[PDB]
C-alpha cells in the first residue's frame, strides 16, 4: 500500500503522543486507574480524532490515558521500547523523539502532573528509564534513535533542569532541547528561565529546536530564532506572513519540521487554503515530514505521506530530497550524520 516505500527520517514526534492502546489498557488494569473504554480497539476511538476539532479539545485527549502511564517506572521504559518498534514498522531508519520528562514524574516535580499523588519517580529516574528503553529498542528493531527533552511554555520554572538533564545524558540518546506547550501565551518566548536555558544550551553544545509558528504569529517564530537561537522550527507555518523573515530564513538555511496531517486535525491549517507546505515545495526550502502524535491522530507516518502525495501532487523526487534535508539537519554528531546520508543516497540509487 505504501506512499513512499523507501528509507525515511523523522525529526518531530512526541512519545506521550505515540503510545499503544493495549499497554495503556494493561497499566490501567494493573494500577486500578479508571479508563473510558475496555477494548484496546474502541479505546483508540475515544482518544483519537477524525474531524478537525481544535487545540482546546485536543489537549483534553491526554487526560484520558496519561494518568495510567505516568509515575510507573515499568511503563516509561516499556513505551519507549514499543515506540522504536512502531517506527521500524513504518520506513523509519532514524528518529528523534521528544517528551517532557517532568510530565511522567510523580516526585520532585513543581506541580505534580495529571492529578496523581506523590510520588516516587523523580524526573531524572524517568529520562534514565526512557533511555534504557530507546537503547534496547535500537538494538532489537534496528533503527537509530536519539531523544529530545521538552520545556513547557506555561512552566518556565522547569526549563532549568531540562537543559541540565540534556547535558548529563548527552552520552545517551539526548541530543537537543525543545519547547512545546502553548504558543499563544503572552510573551512566552521571553520568560526568564526559558531564555537562560537556551543560553546554557548554546554555551554547552546542546542543539536546539522550538515549537513555534504552528498556531501563532510570525513573531513567535522571530523570537525563537533571535532571542532563543533555535536551529530548527517545530511547524513554523504562519511564517509565510513576514516575507522579510521567511526569505532571510531560507537564506540562512532554516529547517522546518512539518506535520501535514497534524495541521489538519489541530485546526492550525484550514482546508480552504493551500497547505502551508506546498509553498515550501515550490520554494526549494529545507524541510522534513513528521507526525507529531500518531495515537491521537490515529495515524502512521504513511498517512502524512499519503496526504502529501494525494491531496497535493508530491512526487518521489521531492520525497527523496526532503528526507535528505532531514538527515542533513538532524542533530547527530557529524561523522554519524555522514553515514546516515551514505545509507540514504545508496537506497535512493545515488552516489557518494
Amino acid at each position: 500500500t505504501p506512499a513512499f516505500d523507501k528509507p525515511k527520517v523523522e525529526l518531530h514526534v512526541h512519545l506521550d503522543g505515540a503510545i499503544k492502546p493495549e499497554t495503556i489498557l494493561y497499566y490501567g488494569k494493573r494500577r486500578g486507574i479508571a479508563l473510558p473504554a475496555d477494548t484496546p480497539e474502541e479505546l483508540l476511538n475515544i482518544i483519537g480524532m477524525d474531524k478537525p476539532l481544535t487545540l482546546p479539545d485536543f489537549l483534553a485527549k491526554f487526560d484520558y490515558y496519561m494518568p495510567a502511564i505516568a509515575g510507573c517506572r515499568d511503563a516509561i521504559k516499556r513505551i519507549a521500547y514499543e515506540f522504536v518498534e512502531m517506527k521500524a514498522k513504518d520506513g523509519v531508519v532514524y528518529v528523534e523523539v521528544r517528551y517532557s520528562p517532568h510530565l511522567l514524574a510523580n516526585s520532585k516535580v513543581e506541580p505534580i502532573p495529571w492529578n496523581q499523588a506523590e510520588g516516587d519517580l523523580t524526573p531524572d529516574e524517568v529520562v534514565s528509564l526512557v533511555n534504557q528503553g530507546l537503547q534496547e529498542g535500537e538494538r532489537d528493531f534496528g533503527v537509530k534513535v536519539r531523544s529530545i527533552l521538552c520545556c513547557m511554555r506555561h512552566q518556565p520554572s522547569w526549563s532549568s533542569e531540562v537543559v541540565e538533564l540534556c547535558k548529563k545524558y548527552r552520552e545517551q540518546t539526548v541530543v537537543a532541547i525543545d519547547l512545546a506547550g502553548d504558543e499563544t501565551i503572552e510573551g512566552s518566548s521571553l520568560f526568564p528561565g526559558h531564555v537562560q536555558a537556551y543560553a546554557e544550551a548554546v554555551k554547552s553544545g546542546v542543539h536546539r529546536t522550538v515549537h513555534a509558528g504552528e498556531v501563532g504569529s510570525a513573531n513567535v517564530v522571530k523570537e525563537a530564532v533571535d532571542t532563543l537561537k533555535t536551529e530548527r522550527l517545530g511547524h513554523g507555518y504562519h511564517t509565510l506572513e513576514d516575507t522579510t523573515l521567511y526569505n532571510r530564513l531560507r537564506q540562512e538555511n532554516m529547517h522546518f519540521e512539518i506535520c501535514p496531517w497534524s495541521s489538519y486535525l489541530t485546526g492550525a491549517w484550514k482546508p480552504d487554503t493551500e497547505h502551508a507546505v506546498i509553498r515550501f515545495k515550490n520554494d526549494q526550502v529545507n524541510y522534513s515530514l513528521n507526525t507529531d502524535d500518531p495515537l491521537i491522530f490515529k495515524s502512521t507516518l504513511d498517512t502524512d505521506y499519503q496526504m502529501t502525495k494525494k491531496d497535493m501532487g508530491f512526487t518521489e523526487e521531492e520525497f527523496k530530497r526532503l528526507n535528505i534535508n532531514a538527515a542533513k539537519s538532524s542533530f547527530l554528531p557529524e561523522d554519524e550524520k555522514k553515514e546516515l546520508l551514505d545509507l540514504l543516497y545508496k537506497a535512493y540509487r545515488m552516489p557518494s
Binding site: 521504559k77 514499543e82 531524572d124 529516574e125 534504557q132 534496547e136 529498542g137
Partner: protein
C-alpha cells in the same frame, strides 16, 4: 553492605484447593487453598529491590531502590531466575520470558551520586534457543573474576554441548574454554 530481595505478587493467581483431614479429633475437614498457576493460567509477577543496611535509621522507614527490568522483558510475562553478586557494588540479574527460549542478563552498578543502581544496555547479554529452552532447567549462573569485569558461565555451544564460556561484561561475544563430545 547491601541486601537485595525479590517481591512476588500473587494477586490474580488462581487457587488450588483440597481437603485436609487432620487428627480424628477434627470434626470438620479443612480446605487447604494455595496460589498455584496451572499451565496457561495467570502467573505471579515480580519486582526486585536493593537496600542499604549501613544507612538504616530507626527514625525513618528504610529506602529500597527498585531495579526495573529489561524493556525486552516488560513487553510481556516474565520471570526473575538468577541473581548473582559480582562485586561489593556490582550485581547481576537474569530474566526469562514466559516463553522460555529467550533470556537476558543485566549487570548493575551502584551510582554514588544518584543513590540508585544503573544497568547500561551495552552490558546486557542475550541468550536464546530455537531447538528448545534456555538452560538445563533455567539459565546458568555467572562466576565473576575478582575485579568483576569478566565472568565464566556454562552455555551450550555450536553443536549443542554445554561448555564453559568466557565473557567480558560489555562485549557481546565470548570464547569457549572447553569443547568436546561431553
Amino acid at each position: 553492605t547491601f541486601l537485595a530481595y525479590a517481591q512476588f505478587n500473587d494477586t490474580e493467581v488462581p487457587l488450588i484447593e483440597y481437603s485436609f483431614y487432620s487428627d480424628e479429633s477434627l470434626q470438620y475437614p479443612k480446605t487447604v487453598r494455595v496460589p498455584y498457576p496451572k499451565a496457561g493460567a495467570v502467573n505471579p509477577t515480580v519486582k526486585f529491590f536493593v537496600v542499604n543496611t549501613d544507612s538504616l535509621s530507626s527514625v525513618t522507614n528504610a529506602t529500597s531502590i527498585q531495579i526495573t527490568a529489561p524493556a525486552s522483558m516488560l513487553i510481556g510475562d516474565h520471570y526473575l531466575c538468577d541473581v548473582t553478586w559480582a562485586t561489593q557494588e556490582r550485581i547481576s540479574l537474569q530474566w526469562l520470558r514466559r516463553i522460555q527460549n529467550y533470556s537476558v542478563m543485566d549487570i548493575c552498578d551502584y551510582d554514588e551520586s544518584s543513590g540508585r543502581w544503573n544497568c547500561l544496555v551495552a552490558r546486557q547479554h542475550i541468550e536464546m534457543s530455537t531447538t528448545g529452552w534456555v538452560g538445563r532447567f533455567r539459565p546458568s549462573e555467572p562466576h565473576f573474576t575478582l575485579d568483576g569485569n569478566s565472568f565464566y558461565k556454562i552455555i551450550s555451544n555450536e553443536e549443542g554441548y554445554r561448555h564453559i564460556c568466557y565473557f567480558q561484561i560489555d562485549k557481546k561475544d565470548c570464547t569457549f574454554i572447553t569443547k568436546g563430545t561431553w
